[PDB]
């Protein structure tokens, strides 16, 4: 259960930081819109509150589980990590 929700939260998170570094990537962050930098606010604040979601479930989960559902998690965490990386690359123009 917690770990399908594990899952479900960072491939949402990972998702919506993806949508703000494309956003970054297309538009020039300085040059943005009011209207884009207000989506990308939601966004962050919305991935936020998704990664505490996480941080709540992590601990409800028992020792041992399957490794392969495990990696499964890890690996959608890792990427969450990787688009967050991205998005902050593309936020302070350094990409």
Same mark, same amino acid.
């Given at each position: 259960?917690?770990?399908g929700?594990?899952?479900?939260? $960072?491939?949402?998170?990972?998702?919506?930081? !993806?949508? +703000?570094?494309?956003?970054?990537? &297309? /538009?020039? =962050?300085?040059?943005?819109?009011?209207?884009?930098?207000e989506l $990308?606010?939601?966004?962050?604040?919305?991935? !936020?509150? +998704?990664?505490?979601?996480?941080? &709540? /479930?992590? =601990?409800?989960?028992a020792?041992?589980?399957?490794?392969?559902? $495990?990696?499964?998690?890890?690996?959608?965490?890792?990427?969450?990590?990787?688009?967050?990386?991205?998005?902050?690359?593309?936020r302070?123009?350094?990409?």
């Amino acid at each position: 259960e917690q770990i399908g929700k594990l899952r479900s939260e $960072l491939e949402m998170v990972s998702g919506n930081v !993806r949508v +703000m570094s494309e956003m970054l990537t &297309e /538009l020039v =962050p300085t040059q943005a819109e009011p209207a884009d930098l207000e989506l $990308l606010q939601e966004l962050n604040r919305t991935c !936020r509150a +998704m990664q505490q979601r996480v941080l &709540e /479930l992590i =601990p409800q989960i028992a020792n041992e589980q399957l490794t392969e559902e $495990l990696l499964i998690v890890n690996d959608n965490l890792n990427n969450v990590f990787l688009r967050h990386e991205r998005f902050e690359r593309f936020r302070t123009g350094q990409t």
